[PDB]
Amino acid sequence: MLKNGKTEDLGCMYKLFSRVPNGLKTMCECMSSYLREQGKALVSEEGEGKNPVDYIQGLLDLKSRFDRFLLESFNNDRLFKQTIAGDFEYFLNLN
Q1: CA distances from 21 to 16, 17, 29, 61, 75 (A)
Q2: Which residue from 8, 22, 74, 89 lies 20 to 30 Å from 83 (Cα-Cα)?
Q3: What start-end ranges are recorded for coiled-coil regions in this protein?
């Protein structure tokens, strides 16, 4: 769903897992990994470079794209907008 950008199902999934302790934290792990997977593929310069929309300025958009999932599906939740940012800075420092 995260790759598909299916926000409604992602939002529908949110409410189900919001019920249990750390269930949303269990999500933080998946977006954390999903964020890390997206980040590493972009920050790793290869060949003759990569398109600006992907890496040069898309890297900053990667957080925004994940922020859209945070907004459109995850109710601008504290736990996500506070946790996933660490991954973004983690592989952003590799620039």
Answers
A1: 12, 9, 14, 31, 17
A2: 8
A3: none
